[PDB]
Design a protein around this ligand. Structure first.
Ligand SMILES: Nc1nc(=O)c2c(CCc3ccc(C(=O)N[C@@H](CCC(=O)O)C(=O)O)cc3)c[nH]c2[nH]1
Length: 407
């Protein structure tokens, strides 16, 4: 039996690791570094040979990491999320070929599949009577981490006047510190699926069938499969589009970290404002999806049809508002799906709704974005993502009227 750690020395260390694991100052400046004068990649080599591997590998490492999170009891996947971080920035700084960058998207996809390895780690580390206070602190330390990583990434690049290569060495110093902090995390002794002391498969699938016939779980899983697949396709490719609108030689004029800190801050407000409307706007739920996906159709169209370099600040605001539109509906989706679900069925449905959204993200990425598919440039393929949300916002508006006229 291992010694119980001090309680105030654990929540302070869960919040300090969860803050320091999000410090990647050169993360918003990966694409202006790859497309810059430091890396020798063509604009069509990044958007068609490199960036679709971020979607392919995330389909390949999604299942494995989702199962190894519960099998290894959530600590070596927090180390694998930090060591694949080091392997991304070791390939940013030392990789030169296109295959070295497709390997970098293989290691970045491990860090995206192991993003739930920290929210589900505190779920199994902390007793349920004490969980909602630590999960409130650690979600505030993660959100403070991804905010100030983009602020420190911006102040070093704009105010500090450091290069993108020096910023990736500052990021590699913060990332080897996050591997050291992940070593001293307290590994749990019982997980949710594979390391409990006991079937679970029988309890879930008997409850999954009865909870699949709810018209709030099906509606917000259909949102999670399709509206979140189009969201990350805009998120992966908007920095390639900002390198087309404002191709500035100076790194201090980039402001990619100022737009990924504003969309973190605006995404925090819309996630806070969604806690007040997740239970009461459940009636007008298809109209809330169609009202936001129509806004997400206009902002991608506004991104796809700005070509003047002085209107790059409109392209930053059309993405901060784009992220804030999606982060408004995620706490509403998280509640309407997981309302009457078991905690083992929350991790199964959200693990499947992420997996089905990654299949849709892989199918579009291969057809629209890959050089083996259509090979479209970032500006033309942002016009197909604009009519992707418009087709989605038509279906949820027709679904709000084909079921709004029944009474
Ligand atoms: N060439 C190239 N360009 C890139 O942009 C890139 C990246 C970043 C891709 C990436 C960025 C954010 C999220 C994501 O899921 N974002 C989260 C959190 C972000 C935050 O909090 O700031 C979200 O849900 O918004 C998912 C994926 C890795 N390798 C790359 N290679």
């Amino acid at each position: 039996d291992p010694e119980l750690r001090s309680w105030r020395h654990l929540v302070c260390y869960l919040c300090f690791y969860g803050f320091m694991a999000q410090i990647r100052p050169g993360e918003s400046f990966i694409t202006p570094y790859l497309l810059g004068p430091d890396k020798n990649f063509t604009r069509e080599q990044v958007t068609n040979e490199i960036t679709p591997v971020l979607s392919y590998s995330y389909l390949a490492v999604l299942v494995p990491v989702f199962l190894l999170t519960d099998y290894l009891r959530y600590t070596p996947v927090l180390l694998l999320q930090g060591l694949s971080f080091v392997s991304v920035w070791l390939l940013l700084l030392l990789g030169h070929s296109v295959a070295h960058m497709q390997l970098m998207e293989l290691f970045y996809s491990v860090t995206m599949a192991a993003r739930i390895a920290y929210s589900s780690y505190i779920f199994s580390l902390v007793r349920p009577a004490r969980y909602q206070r630590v999960a409130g602190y650690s979600r505030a330390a993660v959100l403070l981490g991804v905010f100030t990583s983009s602020v420190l990434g911006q102040l070093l690049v704009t105010v500090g006047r450091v290069s993108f290569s020096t910023l990736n060495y500052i990021s590699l110093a913060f990332l080897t510190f996050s591997v050291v902090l992940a070593l001293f995390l307290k590994r749990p002794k019982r997980s949710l699926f594979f390391n409990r002391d006991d079937s679970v498969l029988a309890r879930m699938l008997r409850e999954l069938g009865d909870s699949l016939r709810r018209p709030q779980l099906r509606l917000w899983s259909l949102w999670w499969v399709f509206n979140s697949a189009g969201y990350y396709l805009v998120v992966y490719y908007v920095h390639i589009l900002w390198n087309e609108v404002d191709p500035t030689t100076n790194s201090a004029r980039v402001y990619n970290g100022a737009a990924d800190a504003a969309s973190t801050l605006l995404g925090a407000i819309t996630s806070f404002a969604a806690g007040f409307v997740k239970i009461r706007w459940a009636r007008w739920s298809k109209l809330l999806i169609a009202g936001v996906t129509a806004t997400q159709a206009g902002l991608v169209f506004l991104l796809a049809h700005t070509r003047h370099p002085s209107s790059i600040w409109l392209c930053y605001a059309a993405f901060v508002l784009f992220r804030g539109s999606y982060q408004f509906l995620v706490p509403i989706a998280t509640f309407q799906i997981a309302s009457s679900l078991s905690k083992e069925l929350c991790a199964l449905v959200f693990g499947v709704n992420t997996f089905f959204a990654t299949i849709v993200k892989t199918i579009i990425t291969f057809i629209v974005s890959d050089v083996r598919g259509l090979g479209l440039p970032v500006r033309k393929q942002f016009q197909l993502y604009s009519v992707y949300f418009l087709i989605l916002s038509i279906i949820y508006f027709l679904g709000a009227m084909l079921d709004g006229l029944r009474h």
